[PDB]
Every structure is written in C-alpha cells, then in structure tokens.
Design a protein around this ligand. Structure first.
Ligand code: SAH
Ligand code: ZN
Ligand code: ZN
Length: 880
C-alpha cells in the first residue's frame, strides 16, 4: 500500500463529522453565490460562469500549465464551464464540447458569455463510443468518485484508454482529469503515458480534500511519483491537527457579447447594395455603429444600430389535449416537443452553425453539366407553357389574411395589415417608384427581413430548441417578385403534368399514389436522401442556371426578372437581430450573394427545379454517362445532350420532387454511390459520412417523403386508398403545444388537430379514438383556429365546422382521382386501420394496459373536459 491508499483507507474509516469537517479543510474556494442566484433567476448575460469548473481551468491557464489555442475539445462537457472559459482566450478560435447528459447528468447550459458564438455544445454524446478527431487543444474532465479504490482505478484506466486515441493525433495543449493517480498500477500507467505523451500532473488547490484528483497538463515537467506522493503528503497532513479555514477568491467574470471571427467576406458588389445600405444607415443614423466583434464569417458586415427585441421562447401546453392524452404524459418522445426559441439569441445560435456557411464553387466540368441540364430542363418546362407577367389584381386576390407587411423604411411603414395596404394607392405608388428604379438599373428598397420560425420540435439540452431562420422582403418588393417570376407558381410550371417529376399542388393524400406508381417501374431501390440545409447550398451557379428562364421571355419581362434576380436574388441585403453586451439587442445589416431565402416568392418552384436537375445529374453519374474526370473538365458534352434527349423524361417520371425533398427510383443500385457530382455541387446528403454509399428501400411504403411514409389500405368493400403515416409521437407532441395564445382559443386549436387526425391519420387507432374524444369534449358549434401543419402539402380541409365524414368522402372518394368507384362510405366503421404490426411500429400503444384503461374511462374523462371547457354549451358524442 502506497501513501495514496493510506489516504483513501483512512478516508473510508471516517464518520459524518470527520468527513464533513475534513472536506473543505484548508482548500480554496470561489464565491459562487451570486452566480447560482442569477443562473437560477435566469440572466444569460453578466458574465457568470455556469459551474465551479471554470475556476479550476483558469487557475491552471494563468499559471502556464496550459496554453489553449485554436480548436478546443471539451470531453465530458457537463454544463460546459470549461468550454465557456476557453472561448475567452485570444488565441482560441473554435470550441466544441461533448457530454452524456440525459438522466442524472448535468446538461449543457446556454449563456451569453464573451465568445459564445465559437462554442458548440452537444449533449447525448457517450465519448467512450466516439471516434477521435484532430484538435489543437484537448480537455477532459471525466472521473466519477467511488468509495472503493479498485473502482476508481479501473474507471480511470478506462478514461486513459479512451483519451489515448485522441492523443495520438498530437494535440498542442491538453488537460485531462486523472481521478485516481495514487495506486501502484496507476503510477506505472501514468509513467509510461508520461513517456509517450509528456506533460505532468498538477494538484489544483480548488479541489476538495475528499478526492485525490490531479490534472494531466501539457506545460508541466514534474515527476509522476513525486507529484502524486507529494499531494498525498498534503492531504494526509491535512487529516491531522485542527481544521484550517478556507481561502475565498472572487469568481471569474467572463464578460458578455460575441467574438470577432476570421472572415471569408466575399466582396459584396457595393455598386448594387450601396444605396440600400446608405438608406438603412441614414434611417438609423443616431445609433449606427460598426460592431468590431460581429460573429459573421461567410457574410459581409456593414453596420449595426440599437433596436428592441422580438420573438419569444415560451411554450404553453394545451390542457385539453394533455388531459385527453394521459398515457403519453410519460412518453419522452411526445413530452419533449415544444416551441423553438425565436429570440435574437435563439435564432442566432442556429444561424452561426447552419446558415453562416460558404460552399466552395464546384469544378468547371460540373458547372458545364449543370448549365446543360438546366437549359434542357427549362426548355422542356416551357414546351407548352409561356412566361407571363402577373398583375396587381392577381396579387390582390392572392394576399390573404395572414400575409406580413415587412416594412423596412419609413415610407413602407404606413399600414397595419397587408390587405389594408394593397387597397391603398400610395402603396402601389411605392411599387411604381421602385420599379422605375429597377428599370433604371438600381434598387432602393428590396431589403430582406430575417428572423426565427416558431416551430414545434423536440428540445435540446432539456430546453426549447433554437429557431430555423426565415427571411422575406416587404410587400412591394414581394410584388415585384410576383410580377416577374410569379408565373412559375401561378401557371403550375412545376406541376406533375408539366415538370414530370414534380408534385406541386398535390396534397398529403395523393403523394402515396405517386410513390406506388414509381414502384411499378423496373429498377433499383428507392432513394430519398434529404439534403442538409438546402437553402444554404444554392450556389451562385445554381442562381445563374435558374435565371435561364429570362431567355424564354419577352424583352421587358426579361429585364424585369433580371432586375429582381440580379438586384435581389443574386445580391441579398439582410437585417437581423443579435444580442449585444449588457443584455441589450441590436440590428445587424449584412449582405451575401449565394443563397436562397426562405420567403422568396418562387422558392418552392426554383428549389424543385434545381433538385430535379441534381437528381438527373446523379442518374447520369450512376449510369456511367459521366466519369471521375468530368468534374475538372467535361469531355464531349454531346454525351450529355444525347442522354437527356434520349432518356431524360423517362428519368423525370422516375422521380417525385417537392423542393428540397425528393424520391428517386433509378435504373439500378449504382445510384447509391453516385456521389462525386452530388458532393461537388454542394448538395451534401444528411445523416451520413460524405462518401458512404446511399441506403434505399425495397418497400415503397417505408420510403420517407415530405416527412411521411405511405401505406395502401383496403376498405371493407374491396376498394383501396393510399394514406399518409408518420410516427405518432410527433403528432401528439405537436398537438400538446400552443404558440402563446383563453380556454376557448385553446379548445378550438385542439378541435383543429382532432379533425386533421380524423382526415389524414384516421388509420391510427389511438389518434382516431383521441379525435372522437377531443371532438366529443369540445363544443360542437366552436370553429377551429390555429395552424396544425407547416407542410405545403397540408391544405386545411379540416379547418371547417362541417361534418367530417363528408370531407372524408369528398377527398378520399368524391375528389379522389385514383378512386374510380364513387360509392361513398356511409359509416366510420367501414374505414379500415393499419395493420396491427404496422400500427405498432409507427408508435401505436395498443395492447398496453395503460392505454386500454385510458380507452375504457375515455368517456368519463370526456365529461371531465366538458366540465373544464364550460358546462352550458352544447356537446355531441362522436365516440359512438
Ligand atoms: N461516459 C461519459 N461520456 C460523456 N460524458 C460523461 C460520461 N460520464 C460522465 N460524463 C459527464 O462528464 C461531466 C464532467 S463534470 C465536468 C464539467 C465541466 N468541467 C464544468 O466546468 O462544469 C459530468 O457532468 C458527467 O455527467
Ligand atoms: Zn428594388
Ligand atoms: Zn406507418
């Protein structure tokens, strides 16, 4: 037995009074009182560290034991105080932390300390099953104390086995937690590892006397046994004599704000945007300034001005759906879904990692192939359709109740609602004036608005997730878009009849028929690889190839669409909100040149187009029509125009494309590894290694498309329908949330979900029962409200006070083109369910005792909810 085992053995023989008195005896501490008071109260600014760990690392760094720089990795991230500290050192550029989290472990915390923009914390990571990655600074703080020294030993040997792979990559600075450095085996192991990787062992005064932990740092050259046994001398010494007091030091203040970053700001053609930048600047001249610490990598920066906050992070629960869905109060999948954080911080922290990218320009051969396929496709789409300008009256008849103004300049902010503006002559005077500027070769007000999109998604770090970015221009500039390129949407250019592979206009009830069609054609498996962040992978050359419609128009229409495209789509000026220092928020004016905004009038069209192009090109690489040399320079383009002229349409009919989503049935499975052109075009797949072959489905029913799969069910009378399905937890979870706004206002928002379930997901036993329960518990004469899906394929047939079997017969029998027999179904009892196995697989709960009890007492619970909503309204019994 060594000195360490002496310390641990004497420690184990202690009692409550002994251990409590000994724990903090003579150690050093930081006043973490105001830190936890503010962290519990809320404030994300003010510079408060998220844990005591931040105090350890700093004490090391300021002593020279560690010199952080470059990319930091924080294994065993925890709350992440080590990451948030590292984000402050000047020579640090990027920080990425990983931790287990979940049940029992602390989850990463979200704070706005100086440099939070260079920190990416990921929870749910088990770093013992992680693959090592190169890094310039490696940090580890993993060691769970044990009463037994054997357990502490084997645990620390597990840790030191893990970290080795990371240390082979030769990191410049490192700081590992050694829980048990005192046993003989551990001293030998640390001796050989000290020989191989160097560094030393340091005892931090801030560690409590109840643990022998030491930190393996780079900037130490001490002897292993000398350091370990000297620390054992210190702790054993402290076990004897009177208890000595603690030395208190003020905790570290990490400031607040964001770091400046190395920029790849592509020169922004100041001739195009200078006038708009000047207009914004002069409009807010009193508080215009250049933030020296803006966090924009792949965007240009022009200035900021002080502006109030907007957006919300709150998520309210719909008590009616909750009360009527008890068995899912324990299911993690549905109880974790909530609204996203659309505040400046909540959007920004998704922006910095998902929107502030720059995709490298593809090789020239790929540029040529893209131009050929785009020209051919455009030509094919205009075979029996003609471009045309859309009109003020079409636009007026298209502006609905929920259409946002978007006023940016003083002129544009004169109306409350959109319909109030369109019926005003001064609005169209703004339109005319700006279009005159367009016809003079200028642009003075087509400026984008960016913010976060309130969505119902699963949370991250046990809190509400961040918000996906959405941007759109004000009403007048949107009108100019509609004028120019609106014909794409109005005349259904991308419809299945014209685009061949498109599915524009169709609803959620029809796509499954399309997929069943696609399966009948001979070929390989079906591939529905989604692209990761489409709107950020639309390159300058994709915009080029999409502008090739202007060579299909008359001269005036061409010049109009080439004022929109060039002055807006090819040069984007965006206004965003960002949290500044001291808790205030600010407006940033930025500008880039190579992405597709979410709210461009023709976004679904152009996206579906470019996606068709991409899938065609991939079909070419798969059928060996292209070769690995073709990326650099294309040899014999005629090898392409012949492939397109020969089999192009016969390939488009093998696709179902809806924007970024798509399904492709190729001629064989070579499509699985046709990755060179796909990757070179920036359309990197989702949820895979870049060069791993693609995986597909031999069962057309299991294929994902537009967030659903589709199943063919047979009615009682022999007929058949093809219905959309998804995992039930997303449906109930999405149903249990409310976007901020009486009980009536909620109960209606519940009836909408219940009727949508009665219309689309009637084949999910639980959702049908719960639909009858909600509708039985909600007053009959109450009109539904709210939104139940963001899908462009969710048409809203359920948002009515009309009987539901009527609309079911209408959309599944009467107006069903794939249903030839029109004999309507007379009772809900004749409409089938999914198979019990297929129902279970997608998240059914049938056969489980809890939900059988729920279904038995469902009527009594309905009467309960009738008590809660109101007892003098009229109700109906749909459960029968
Ligand atoms: N197997 C594992 N894989 C990843 N993380 C783990 C893990 N086992 C434990 N952890 C987590 O690693 C964390 C280390 S605590 C260190 C936290 C950080 N240094 C700070 O300043 O707050 C613990 O919270 C623990 O929950
Ligand atoms: Zn303009
Ligand atoms: Zn299913």
């Amino acid at each position: 037995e060594t000195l360490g085992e002496k310390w641990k053995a004497r420690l184990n023989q202690m009692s409550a009074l002994e251990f409590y008195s000994y724990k903090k005896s003579g150690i050093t501490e930081v006043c973490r009182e105001e830190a936890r008071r503010a962290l519990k109260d809320g404030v994300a600014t003010g510079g408060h560290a998220v844990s005591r760990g931040s105090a350890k690392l700093r004490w090391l760094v300021e002593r020279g034991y560690l010199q952080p720089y470059g990319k930091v990795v924080d294994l065993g991230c925890g709350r992440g105080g080590w990451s948030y500290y590292a984000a402050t050192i000047r020579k640090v550029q990027e920080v990425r932390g990983y931790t287990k989290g979940g049940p029992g472990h602390e989850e990463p915390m979200l704070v706005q300390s100086y440099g939070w923009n260079i920190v990416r914390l990921k929870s749910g990571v088990d770093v013992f099953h992680m693959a090592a990655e190169p890094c310039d600074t490696l940090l580890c703080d993993i060691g769970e104390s044990s009463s037994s020294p054997e357990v502490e030993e084997t645990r620390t040997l597990r840790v030191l086995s893990m970290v080795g792979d990371w240390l082979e990559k030769r990191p410049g600075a490192f700081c590992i937690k050694v829980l048990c450095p005192y046993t003989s085996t551990m001293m030998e192991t640390m001796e050989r590892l000290q020989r191989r990787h160097g560094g030393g062992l340091v005892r931090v005064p801030l560690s409590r006397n109840s643990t022998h932990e030491m930190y393996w740092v780079s900037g130490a050259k001490s002897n292993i046994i000398k350091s370990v046994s000297t620390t054992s001398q210190l702790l054993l010494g402290r076990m004897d004599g009177p208890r000595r007091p603690v030395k208190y030091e003020e905790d570290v203040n990490l400031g607040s704000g964001t770091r400046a970053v190395a920029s790849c700001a592509e020169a922004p053609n100041m001739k195009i945007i200078g006038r708009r930048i000047e207009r914004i600047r002069n409009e807010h001249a009193e508080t215009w300034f250049l933030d020296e610490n803006h966090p924009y990598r792949t965007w240009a920066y022009h200035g900021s001005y002080e502006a109030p906050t907007q957006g919300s992070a709150s998520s309210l629960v719909n008590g009616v759906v909750r009360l009527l869905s008890k068995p899912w109060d324990v299911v993690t999948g549905v109880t974790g879904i909530a609204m996203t954080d659309t505040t400046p911080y909540g959007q920004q922290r998704v922006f910095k990692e998902k929107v502030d990218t720059r995709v490298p320009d593809p090789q020239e051969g790929t540029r040529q192939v893209m131009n050929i396929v785009s020209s051919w496709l455009w030509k094919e789409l205009g075979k029996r359709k003609r471009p045309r300008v859309c009109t003020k009256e079409e636009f007026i008849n298209k502006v609905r109740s929920n259409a946002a103004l978007g006023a940016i300049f003083e002129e544009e902010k004169e109306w409350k609602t959109a319909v109030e503006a369109v019926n005003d002559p001064r609005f169209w005077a703004l339109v005319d004036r700006e279009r005159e500027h367009h016809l003079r070769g200028e642009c003075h007000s087509c400026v984008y608005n960016m913010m976060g999109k309130r969505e119902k998604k699963q949370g991250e770090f046990g809190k509400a997730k961040g918000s996906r970015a959405i941007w759109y221009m004000w009403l007048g500039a949107r009108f100019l878009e509609f004028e120019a390129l609106g014909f794409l949407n109005e005349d259904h250019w991308m419809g299945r009849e014209n685009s061949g592979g498109g599915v524009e206009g169709l609803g959620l009830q029809r796509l499954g028929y399309i997929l069943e069609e696609m399966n009948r054609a001979p070929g390989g498996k079906m591939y529905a690889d989604d692209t990761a962040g489409w709107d950020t992978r639309i390159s300058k050359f994709d915009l080029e190839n999409e502008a090739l419609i202007t060579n299909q128009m008359e001269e005036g229409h061409r010049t109009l669409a080439l004022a929109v495209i060039k002055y807006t789509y090819q040069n984007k000026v965006v206004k965003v909100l960002r949290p500044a220092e001291g808790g205030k928020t600010v407006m940033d004016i930025i500008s880039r040149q190579d992405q597709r905004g979410s709210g461009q009038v023709v976004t679904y069209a152009l996206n579906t187009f470019t996606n068709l192009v991409v899938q065609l090109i991939r079909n070419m690489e798969a059928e060996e029509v292209l070769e690995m040399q073709d990326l650099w320079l294309l040899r014999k383009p005629e090898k392409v125009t012949r492939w397109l002229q020969s089999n192009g349409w016969d390939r488009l009919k093998r696709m179902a494309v809806s924007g970024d989503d798509c399904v492709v049935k190729p001629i064989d499975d070579r499509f699985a590894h046709a990755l060179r052109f796909l990757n070179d075009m920036g359309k990197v797949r989702k949820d895979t290694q870049e060069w791993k072959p693609s995986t597909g489905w031999s069962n057309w029913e299991e294929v994902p498309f537009c967030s659903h799969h589709f199943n063919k069910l047979y009615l009682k009378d022999g007929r058949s329908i093809v219905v959309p399905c998804r995992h039930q937890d997303e449906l109930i979870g999405r149903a249990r949330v409310s976007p901020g706004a009486s009980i009536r206002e909620t109960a209606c928002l519940a009836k909408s979900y219940a009727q949508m379930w009665q219309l689309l997901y009637f084949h999910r036993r639980d959702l049908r029962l719960m639909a009858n329960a909600i509708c039985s518990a909600v007053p009959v004469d109450w009109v539904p409200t709210g939104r139940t899906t963001w899908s462009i394929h969710g048409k809203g047939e359920w948002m009515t006070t009309e009987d539901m079997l009527m609309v079911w017969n209408r959309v599944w029998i009467e107006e069903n083109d794939h249903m030839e027999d029109k004999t309507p179904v007379t009772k809900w009892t004749d409409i089938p369910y999914l198979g019990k196995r297929e129902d279970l697989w997608c998240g059914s709960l049938i056969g489980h005792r809890p939900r059988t009890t729920w279904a038995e007492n469902i009527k009594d619970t309905v009467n309960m909810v009738r008590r809660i909503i109101g007892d003098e309204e009229k109700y109906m019994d749909y459960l029968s």
